[PDB]
Amino acid sequence: GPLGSMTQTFSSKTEWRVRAISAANLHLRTNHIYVSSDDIKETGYTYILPKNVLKKFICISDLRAQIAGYLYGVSPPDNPQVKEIRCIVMVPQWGTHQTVHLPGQLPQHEYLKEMEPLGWIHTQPNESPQLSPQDVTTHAKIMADNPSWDGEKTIIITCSFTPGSCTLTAYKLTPSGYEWGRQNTDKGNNPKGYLPSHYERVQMLLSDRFLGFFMVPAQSSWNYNFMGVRHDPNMKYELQLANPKEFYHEVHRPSHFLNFALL
């Protein structure tokens, strides 16, 4: 019975400052990147991801909120069974630890008009063995809305934060996968009808022989996890040839710089 005798006072410990201190060190994880590389589909397309944009993508992310990029690329001359990823497009987005939220409008830009879309890459906190039902649903909805996404040519690369490192795996949807994903409204983790036959691993390699580039939004940045209000599923955006700013950049959270200053 210490009410009055023993009295302590609570001191705020706002959540994102720890995550920011943590994200400042992500660059260490980019020296130990591993691809799952299981002997799956030796005859499907192969996907080469340039290391430069992957390191950048890891470095601009958060350790709990997922970020996503769109993949654009091309097949190397007289070798059509290879898809070299040439570009990663960052669009206005927000995320939770299980899913990412993007505008329904796909990227459009002259620089992109020569390339084909190859699906998307996203980060996730842990190394699940199967492809997420949220991922299968997201990919299928996207496909249903955009005929330029061949279910046989577009893939989903998950970048999972294994301790001290970064493990990459690449999947694609199966026909039954597409058909189930497009009709799924259960945002939960065990929705009705989900099946492991809905996806299959595709081979993926990390290269150094060439370099990717980034396109970013023209009038803003890509991160809206501090402005999720201002994010809209129907928002339109232009792009520009520039490199994305890291997750906790000042322009991503202008509230933190204006509120506590003016008040």
Whole-angstrom distance, CA of residue 73 vs CA of residue 86: 4
Burial of 51 (0-12, 13-18, 19+ CB in 10 A): middle
Contact between 27 and other proteins by CB under 8 A: the answer reads yes
Contact between 241 and other proteins by CB under 8 A: the answer reads yes
Contact between 7 and other proteins by CB under 8 A: the answer reads no
Site for other proteins in 30-59 (CB under 8 A): 52, 56
Which of the stretches 91-99, 120-128, 133-141, 205-213 binds other proteins when contact is defined by CB under 8 A? Answer: 205-213
Going by C-alpha positions, the residue among 141, 197, 189 that lies closest to residue 172 is 197
Nearer Cβ to other proteins, position 177 or 244? 244
231-248 burial string, b = 16+ CB within 10 Å, else e?
beeebebebeeeebbbbb
We find the least distance from the C-beta atom of residue 119 to other proteins, in angstroms, to be 20
Radius of gyration of the chain from its Cα atoms, rounded to whole angstroms: 20
Among 41, 109, 231, 256, which residue interacts with other proteins (rule: CB under 8 A)?
A: 256
Which of the stretches 38-46, 120-128, 162-170, 244-252 binds other proteins when contact is defined by CB under 8 A? Answer: 244-252
Among 212, 217, 222, 224, which residue interacts with other proteins (rule: CB under 8 A)?
A: 212
The residues of the shown chain that bind other proteins, judged by CB under 8 A, are: 11-14, 17-18, 20-21, 24, 27, 52, 56, 86, 111, 209-213, 219-220, 230, 240-243, 246, 248, 250-251, 253-254, 256-258, 260-261
